[PDB]
Amino acid sequence: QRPPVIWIGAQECTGCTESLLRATHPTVENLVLETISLEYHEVLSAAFGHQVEENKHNALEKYKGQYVLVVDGSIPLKDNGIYCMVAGEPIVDHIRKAAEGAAAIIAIGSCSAWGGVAAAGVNPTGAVSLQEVLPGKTVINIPGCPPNPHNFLATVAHIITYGKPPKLDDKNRPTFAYGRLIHEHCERRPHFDAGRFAKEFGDEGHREGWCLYHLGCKGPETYGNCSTLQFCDVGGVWPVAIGHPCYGCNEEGIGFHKGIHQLANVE
């Protein structure tokens, strides 16, 4: 038997599920056939409508106390929950119900971890985080927009293999992935130190791989593993390495709040 997972999407763009399709360890096919039993996931389920809702109810019962609950997207509280309705009920009710029997609860992505883009600006829908709607529960936060999928998959694997979550920081983020500022482990730090800065995309310094601080890099104020684990497992691929500043998408108050070219505070 494989450990069961229930995945519920709230105000999600589906990028957090899509991250799984880039994963290699495990690939999504090996995740669902070998690593876990994905008991509910609306993007991939053969069943629809009343049949998939029956699946969910049956799994919630059969695996009570055993499943990992995963949520992507923010949860909208404005106007009594009506900005996300599934099967005629507010998504916040589906999530609270499923949280009751969960062995572990994970907020995958910035939206569920801290509200994310959906909670920015004027916050049209009163979008909030998963932790906000589950005050009695310890929600494991895996932020990023979307995170590297292995930030999620290795968190799940730690729960499965060693029987507890990975070590977390004081925002309940796994330290192996979010334990350090990007700027405190960035390969362009020597350039920062020397005052070697790109000033515009395509300028001479940009074309030599110099630091992106003066283009608005938020590495100095964003916790993550983007410079080390990077993305897509091909080597050398993260925003800064490609030539664009970190936007701070992992980090509440940075991504989606600060402008791309607004300068970060440096510690």
Binding site: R2, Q11, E12, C13, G15, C16, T17, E18, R22, T24, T27, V28, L33, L38, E42, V43, L44, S45, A46, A47, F48, G49, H50, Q51, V52, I82, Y83, C84, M85, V86, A87, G88, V117, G121, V122, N123, P124, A127, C145, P146, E187, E200, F201, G202, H206, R207, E208, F231, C232, V234, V237, P239, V240, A241, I242, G243, H244, G259, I260, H261
Partner: protein, 551 residues
């Protein structure tokens, strides 16, 4: 009549409810409803125009890249910026590779379980399954040994008693028509598809900085630093690496996806005669290759009342006829202002009042083109290319038809493309033609860099006063996308996205005219109203994306 509700519709992006009235087992009327809103248009307002693309890219992570590209095009339009040709090549590669991943995943992961019965695959003979494909495909992974391995994977899953995402599927439904062997082949291909789409996204990642959600755009071009001799930038080694993944896509697309599309049509020919959503079609040209935001590799146009011979070409993203025709209504949507609005003057004022059959029932707006309902997406884009006499499209369609004719003895006529299967075919044709776009644009880039052009970015200036308007068009995997930006005193004063699934999934409009999803469902036979697979088959052919439709 009987009333049914399908909520949630699964194997789509986002949150969709479909209701149907069924008279004597035939759908007589339907309702499409987007059930989740974020207000992304309002979230991006009152910001620097340069910042929009990073925010509105998050309209969708399935069609990642698309809203980012449309947003920068819209700001560029407002500002009158001509994008450097290297930046176009790079945007083009990203969009084509992304769309390759997107379409493959739609056919296999999202759609195949409408047509494929996994239980039936357990009864297959792997050797006979392999033999069925002799002379039908040259794909290297159609052996009985591959098929036996896949069959054993299914067997092991069923024997675990944990079917998960395969549980309570429509196994043995009367509308499942494939033989066991073909079911088994499709499962093998479903798993192989996952490798191919992963390679497509490796292309996207090496230019975008990651995927989902690329990070290499700018209003004014791209953030990739082109320097063949530079350490840590886009040099020849990195380009070679990109090319290595581009080269891995074609065989699966041509020998598996293209072939399966013909075969599904062969087993389900009644699906060529239902699921017509509209009589008018629209697509925009795509893949610009000059220094002035034009010279597109794919053509665009407008087809009215299915007449290909009288269609109107669209060759520019500044086409005034296109621009002025587009409006959206919220008469039957949960917004306050109901009269049709041009998007530069659009509002998005929420006004939820619950479901009403005759009132408001969706978060999706109702778009029209000069007052008409219009289907967008790969059916539209294929039909426009056929109307334009694009030989590449003609020839690729003919290849599908040839396989279909080998299996059935019948040909396909254009009339039969206005259907659920025609829509799927259009998608496949697009994916196949996109491989040549990738080769063409990679070669264009290498050639241009060789001539000494390393330019990638034109720094904008944004007047601190004045009001000015721009629109960015893009031919996305699901159809014509447009982002409409008004800038006033240097910040975004209005922002309206009119998205392809908005055209197709929108509810009844200001004139109570029915949109494509809702129209397509009239006439659908429903054998078992508790398990309305036939409804979902048609809906899935449009590749719904509700985060897109609603934003």
């Amino acid at each position: 009549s009987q009333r049914i509700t399908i909520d949630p519709v699964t194997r789509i992006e986002g949150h969709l409810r479909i209701d149907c009235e069924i008279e004597n087992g035939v759908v007589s009327k339907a309702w499409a409803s987007g059930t989740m809103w974020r207000g992304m248009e309002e979230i991006v307002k009152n910001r620097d125009p340069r910042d929009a693309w990073m925010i509105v890219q998050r309209i969708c992570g399935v069609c990642t890249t698309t809203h980012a590209l449309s947003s920068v095009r819209a700001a560029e339009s407002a500002l009158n910026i001509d994008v450097p040709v290297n930046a176009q090549y790079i945007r083009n590669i990203i969009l084509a590779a992304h769309t390759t991943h997107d379409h493959i995943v739609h056919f296999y992961q999202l759609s195949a379980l409408d047509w494929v019965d996994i239980t039936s695959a357990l009864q297959a003979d792997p050797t006979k399954a392999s033999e069925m494909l002799k002379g039908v495909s040259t794909w290297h992974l159609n052996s009985p040994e591959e098929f036996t391995k896949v069959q054993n994977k299914i067997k092991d899953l069923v024997a675990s008693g944990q079917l998960g995402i395969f549980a309570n599927g429509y196994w043995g439904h009367p509308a499942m028509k494939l033989p066991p062997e073909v079911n088994l082949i499709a499962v093998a291909h479903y798993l192989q598809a996952l490798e191919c789409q992963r390679d497509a996204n490796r292309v996207v990642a090496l230019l975008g900085g990651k995927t989902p959600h690329i990070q290499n755009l700018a209003v004014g071009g791209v953030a990739n630093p082109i320097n063949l001799d530079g350490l840590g930038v886009l040099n020849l080694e990195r380009l070679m690496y990109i090319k290595s993944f581009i080269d891995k896509l074609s065989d699966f697309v041509e020998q598996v996806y293209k072939v399966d599309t013909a075969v599904i049509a062969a087993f389900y020919p009644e699906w060529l005669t239902r699921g017509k959503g509209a009589v008018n079609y629209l697509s925009v040209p795509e893949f610009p290759t000059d220094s002035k935001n034009g010279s597109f590799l794919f053509p665009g146009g407008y087809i009215e009342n299915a007449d290909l011979s009288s269609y109107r070409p669209i060759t520019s993203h500044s086409d005034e006829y296109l621009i002025k025709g587009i409006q959206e209504s919220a008469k039957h949507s949960w917004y306050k202002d109901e009269a049709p609005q041009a998007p530069w003057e659009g509002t998005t004022i929420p006004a939820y009042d619950g479901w009403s059959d005759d009132g408001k029932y969706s978060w999706v707006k109702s778009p029209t083109f000069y007052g008409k309902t219009v289907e967008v997406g790969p059916l539209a884009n294929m039909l426009v290319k056929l109307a334009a006499g694009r030989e590449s499209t003609q020839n690729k369609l003919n290849e599908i038809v040839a396989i279909y004719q080998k299996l059935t003895g019948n040909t396909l006529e254009v009339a039969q493309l206005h259907s659920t299967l025609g829509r799927i075919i259009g998608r496949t044709v697009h994916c196949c033609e996109l491989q040549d776009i990738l080769q063409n644009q990679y070669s264009a880039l290498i050639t241009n860099i060789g001539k000494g052009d390393h330019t990638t970015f034109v720094k904008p200036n944004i007047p601190a006063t004045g009001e000015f308007k721009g629109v960015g068009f893009l031919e996305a995997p699901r159809g014509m996308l447009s982002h409409w930006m008004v800038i006033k005193d240097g910040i975004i004063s209005n922002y309206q996205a009119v998205v392809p699934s908005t055209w197709n999934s929108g509810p009844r409009n200001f004139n109570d005219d029915v949109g494509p999803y809702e129209q397509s469902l009239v006439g659908t036979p429903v054998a078992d109203p508790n398990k309305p697979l036939e409804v979902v088959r048609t809906i899935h052919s449009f590749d719904p994306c509700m985060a897109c439709a609603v934003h």
